């Protein structure tokens, strides 16, 4: 599928749970706590580099938050937790400026989904886009879906028809894309690593 629309104002749920890194996307799951891919989290460590809360072309910021630390999932899955410092250098509070996306607790093949993130962000001044498609395969922590995606979509939340989080995109092949599918085990890892 290629139905891709810009979200010009991402101050509303669920778009206000989406975050921009240099080089890709993440999603907010709880207090000070973001989920993304390993390379997105890790690389952003080299330049260690702020995250922008739901950047969009027309919404009120957001705010841009310094990364406190990361927790990489111990297994092969392309999953990392990123903690931010709650208060931005402009005095905005992360938790007052985002929402926490709820878990879907799984999905079925043929389910209609949305991938939301920042394809070609460096070229678009980090416009947020939502791309719709279908789940084509689920196996363990692996899923495939056909929502159109590009460089910049790494770490993008894949949401179900109720705005709940099924997993995150990690790879293309494109309209043939791969994600980390959140099994109970992955959900537990994420939840155990949300700040109190």
From Swiss-Prot:
<keyword id="KW-0964">Secreted</keyword>
<dbReference type="GO" id="GO:0006508">
    <property type="term" value="P:proteolysis"/>
</dbReference>
<keyword id="KW-0720">Serine protease</keyword>
<comment type="similarity">
    <text>Belongs to the peptidase S1B family.</text>
</comment>
<dbReference type="InterPro" id="IPR001254">
    <property type="entry name" value="Trypsin_dom"/>
</dbReference>
<dbReference type="InterPro" id="IPR028301">
    <property type="entry name" value="V8_his_AS"/>
</dbReference>
<dbReference type="Pfam" id="PF00089">
    <property type="entry name" value="Trypsin"/>
</dbReference>
<keyword id="KW-0732">Signal</keyword>
<dbReference type="InterPro" id="IPR008353">
    <property type="entry name" value="Peptidase_S1B_tx"/>
</dbReference>
<dbReference type="InterPro" id="IPR008256">
    <property type="entry name" value="Peptidase_S1B"/>
</dbReference>
<dbReference type="InterPro" id="IPR009003">
    <property type="entry name" value="Peptidase_S1_PA"/>
</dbReference>
<feature type="active site" description="Charge relay system">
    <location>
        <position position="78"/>
    </location>
</feature>
<dbReference type="GO" id="GO:0005576">
    <property type="term" value="C:extracellular region"/>
</dbReference>
<keyword id="KW-0378">Hydrolase</keyword>
<keyword id="KW-0645">Protease</keyword>
<feature type="active site" description="Charge relay system">
    <location>
        <position position="154"/>
    </location>
</feature>
<dbReference type="GO" id="GO:0004252">
    <property type="term" value="F:serine-type endopeptidase activity"/>
</dbReference>
<protein>
    <recommendedName>
        <fullName>Serine protease SplA</fullName>
        <ecNumber>3.4.21.-</ecNumber>
    </recommendedName>
</protein>
<dbReference type="InterPro" id="IPR043504">
    <property type="entry name" value="Peptidase_S1_PA_chymotrypsin"/>
</dbReference>
<feature type="active site" description="Charge relay system">
    <location>
        <position position="39"/>
    </location>
</feature>
């Amino acid at each position: 599928e290629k139905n891709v629309k810009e979200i010009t104002d991402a101050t509303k749920e669920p778009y206000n749970s989406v975050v921009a890194f240099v080089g890709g996307t993440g999603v907010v799951v709880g207090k000070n706590t973001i989920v993304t891919n390993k390379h997105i989290a890790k690389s952003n460590d080299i330049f260690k580099n702020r995250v922008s809360a739901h950047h969009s072309s027309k919404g009120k910021g957001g705010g841009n938050y310094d990364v406190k630390d990361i927790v990489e999932y111990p297994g092969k899955e392309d999953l990392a937790i990123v903690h931010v410092h709650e208060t931005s250098t402009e005095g905005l509070n992360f938790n007052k400026n985002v929402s926490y996306t709820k878990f879907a607790d799984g999905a079925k093949v043929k389910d209609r989904i949305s991938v939301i993130g920042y394809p070609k962000g460096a070229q678009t001044k980090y416009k947020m886009f939502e791309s719709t498609g279908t789940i084509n395969h689920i196996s363990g922590t692996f899923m495939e879906f056909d929502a159109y995606a590009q460089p910049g979509n790494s770490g993008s939340p894949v949401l179900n028809s109720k705005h709940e989080l099924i997993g995150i995109l990690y790879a293309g092949s494109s309209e043939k894309n791969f994600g980390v599918y959140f099994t109970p085990q992955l959900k537990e890892f994420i939840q155990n690593n949300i700040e109190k």
